[PDB]
Design a binder for this molecule. Structure first.
Ligand SMILES: CC(=O)N[C@@H]1[C@@H](O)[C@H](O)[C@@H](CO)O[C@H]1O
Ligand SMILES: CC(=O)N[C@@H]1[C@@H](O)[C@H](O)[C@@H](CO)O[C@H]1O
Ligand SMILES: *[C@@H]1O[C@H](CO)[C@@H](O)[C@H](O)[C@H]1NC(C)=O
Ligand SMILES: *[C@@H]1O[C@H](CO)[C@@H](O)[C@H](O)[C@H]1NC(C)=O
Lengths: 595, 49
């Protein structure tokens, strides 16, 4: 009649009853998206309602655990999930409107109106702002587009921040912790394991460590901008100063993707692009996916199972049926995986589906694992393998076996600088914001930042540490850490933080084993069994062992490498040294829109 | 466990608690007959044979 005797069988029986209900939620997503019925709309909500809250009813007897040793299996790790009680510590009256207040500004942001002079036509944040991002050369429009959006709602977002921190921290207090950031470190927490134990607070320090390799990348681009952007905007671009953030292809400067216009190498030499030369074999919608399938054998990844042929659409619907442009691929297991775009005869189908390709092949590596441990070494491993090979999917020199290259290789630099700089645009503009935002959450979680230095410091540190300018600072009138959905719904950037540098090491793992030297754009990843053998270990190892052991194996070095980042674009960084060696390096913090 | 070369009868309703059900339904356990949800996207191992 022992409760441990009950729990031993109950835990084993629970994992199988859970999977049947867990699988159903993702299946209704497409069915509801194409025809809405009363049964269709409720399937996911009533399926998942018996997962989180109902877990506690099965979890009540998980607190009677003893210093019993018999548990030595990875079971102890699922057992923590069996020990979760949920938000039951919260009172009903104080959480009744917590859900209401949490999503209140999301509706306002989605249903937002941008004021326009003379009200000539209707305007919206997305894609209305991006459509006319570079339509004219008016600074006034660029300022006013974001100024009106802020003056619309951003003042009233301040009350959102009052109860959010208290309620978030109360989870830690109910969970015998002082801070919720230490509760987020459950995937990085390991105990009673010799020489393979990691500390939750250690992952605190990397913010200081990770920025040492960010400044070298920002410095090389700034020298390039110094040459060209003075003529276009001379009123707010000084050579010895921070690169302006209010003249780029972004509303907030988060994603610096639209930098090609301001950093085009030459205006007299158009970039090489072949479309009609490629169609001599009757290019159709199926051609792109056939070439994607041929990409599998050049990457050694096995072809995905029957789920590739039924759940994924590879052609236009052709009827009034409406499809989802956003990909929807879930790790349900049992062969259920999706690659879904707005599938037509479009060039974008070449790239977006490829982004899901790494998301596909990883899952079958650990689909056999239980859903409770159905993931990679860490949270960022899922989104890391999906982008490492995407860089090789746009280079046509790696596409010799495509049949469409005609390998009349150009004289190196003369051509490559035009193309490779574009890919550099991917690796430069996302580091600073990811660096700065991740720091703020960790300091505010513990509370060591005073209230007088919690709001103003958001802009005080911005001028000196990262070195960026804003169109309008917010001191105590707009709440800048309240205008994002991530902040308004308690989201962090730990998903994009660990893999940010580790992806380059993952891509270099495919070449270092293959004994390839030089730039990484001329690496042959074809018919390589050495790379596939290495890739097939940690894909299937999963979460069975502590992540500390896998961390040493995957990268081989306990420190971060900076030469792989600078080696893929070696000509690009080297060429800027000759023209900028006789110039002032860096930027001066004295000049800034502080006053 | 079952014995070799003998047929299985699935009648007893199992209860997680080691106390007998005594004709009363219980929580956290259900009837031990499992209806496999058969989707055409299932793998061959998952497919019934
Ligand atoms: C109003 C509406 O959504 N109608 C759709 C119809 O267009 C589609 O053909 C059908 C699936 O066969 O599902 C339903
Ligand atoms: C010649 C050209 O421009 N394009 C292609 C070529 O790459 C390909 O090898 C050939 C048949 O394989 O069909 C054509
Ligand atoms: C690359 O270097 C060579 C070396 O002489 C030079 O001729 C060429 O112009 C350079 N390419 C670019 C894009 O500057
Ligand atoms: C892989 O490519 C071809 C197979 O089509 C083969 O001839 C070649 O030797 C292999 N290895 C390398 C390094 O190309």
């Amino acid at each position: 009649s022992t409760t441990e005797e009950q729990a031993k069988t109950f835990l084993e029986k629970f994992n199988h009853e859970a999977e049947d209900l867990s699988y159903q939620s993702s299946l209704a997503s497409w069915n509801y998206n194409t025809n809405i019925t009363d049964e269709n709309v409720q399937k996911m909500n009533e399926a998942r309602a018996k997962w989180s809250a109902f877990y506690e009813e099965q979890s009540r007897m998980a607190k009677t655990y003893s210093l019993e040793e018999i548990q030595n299996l990875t079971l102890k790790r699922q057992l923590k999930a069996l020990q979760q009680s949920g938000t039951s510590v919260l009172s009903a009256e104080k959480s009744k409107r917590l859900n209401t207040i949490l999503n209140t500004m999301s509706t306002i942001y989605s249903t937002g109106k941008v004021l326009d002079p003379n009200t000539q036509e209707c305007l919206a944040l997305e894609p209305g702002l991006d459509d006319i991002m570079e339509n004219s050369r008016d600074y006034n429009r660029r300022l006013w587009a974001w100024e009106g959006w802020r003056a619309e709602v951003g003042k009233q977002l301040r009350p959102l921040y009052e109860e959010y921190v208290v309620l978030e921290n109360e989870m830690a207090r109910a969970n015998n912790y002082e801070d919720y950031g230490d509760y987020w470190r459950g995937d990085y927490e390991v105990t009673e394991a010799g020489d393979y134990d990691y500390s939750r607070d250690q992952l605190m320090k990397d913010v200081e460590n990770t920025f040492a390799e960010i400044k070298p990348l920002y410095e090389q681009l700034h020298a390039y901008v110094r040459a060209k952007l003075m003529d276009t905007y001379p009123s707010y671009i000084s050579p010895t100063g921070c690169l302006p953030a209010h003249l780029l292809g972004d509303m907030w400067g988060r994603f610096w993707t639209n930098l090609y216009s301001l950093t085009v190498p030459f205006k007299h030499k158009p970039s090489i692009d072949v479309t009609e030369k490629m169609k001599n074999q009757s290019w159709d919608a199926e051609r792109i996916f056939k070439e994607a399938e041929k990409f599998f054998v050049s990457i050694s990844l096995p072809h995905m199972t029957q789920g590739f042929w039924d759940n994924s659409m590879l052609t236009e619907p052709g009827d009034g049926r409406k499809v989802v442009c956003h990909p929807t691929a879930w790790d349900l297991g049992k062969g259920d995986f999706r690659i879904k775009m707005c599938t037509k005869v479009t060039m974008d189908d070449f790239l977006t589906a490829h982004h899901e390709m790494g998301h596909i092949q990883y899952d079958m590596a650990y689909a056999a694992q239980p859903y409770l441990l159905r993931d990679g070494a860490n949270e960022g491993f899922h989104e890391a393998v999906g982008e490492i090979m995407s860089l090789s999917a746009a280079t046509p020199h790696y596409l010799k076996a495509l049949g469409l290259l005609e390998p009349d290789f150009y004289e190196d630099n003369e051509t490559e600088i035009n193309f490779l700089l574009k890919q550099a645009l991917t690796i430069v503009g996302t580091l600073p914001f990811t660096y700065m935002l991740e720091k703020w959450r960790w300091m505010v979680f513990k509370g060591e930042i005073p209230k007088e230095q919690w709001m103003e410091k958001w802009w005080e540190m911005k001028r000196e540490i990262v070195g960026v300018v804003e169109p309008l600072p917010h001191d105590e009138t707009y709440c800048d850490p309240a205008c994002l959905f991530h902040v308004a719904e308690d989201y962090s950037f730990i998903r994009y933080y660990t893999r940010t540098i580790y992806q380059f090491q993952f891509h270099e793992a495919l070449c270092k084993t293959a004994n390839h030297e030089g730039a990484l754009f001329k690496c042959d990843i074809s018919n390589s069994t050495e790379a596939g053998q290495r890739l097939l270990q940690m894909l299937s190892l999963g979460k069975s062992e502590p992540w500390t052991l896998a961390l040493e194996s995957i990268v081989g070095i306990k420190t971060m490498d900076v030469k792989p980042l600078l080696n893929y674009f070696e000509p690009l960084f080297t060429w800027l040294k000759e023209q900028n060696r006789n110039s002032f390096v860096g930027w001066s913090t004295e000049w800034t829109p502080y006053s | 466990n079952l014995k070799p070369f003998e047929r299985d009868i699935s009648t007893e309703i199992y209860q997680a608690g080691n106390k007998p059900c005594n004709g009363v339904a219980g929580v956290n356990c259900y009837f031990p007959l499992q209806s496999y949800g058969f989707r055409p996207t299932y793998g061959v191992g998952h497919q019934p044979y």
